[PDB]
């Protein structure tokens, strides 16, 4: 299976 994750961490 293809599953895309994004992940953008602040401060």
Same mark, same amino acid.
């Given at each position: #299976? ?5 992940? /953008?961490? #602040? /401060?």
């Amino acid at each position: #299976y293809t599953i895309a994750a994004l992940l /953008s961490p #602040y /401060s």
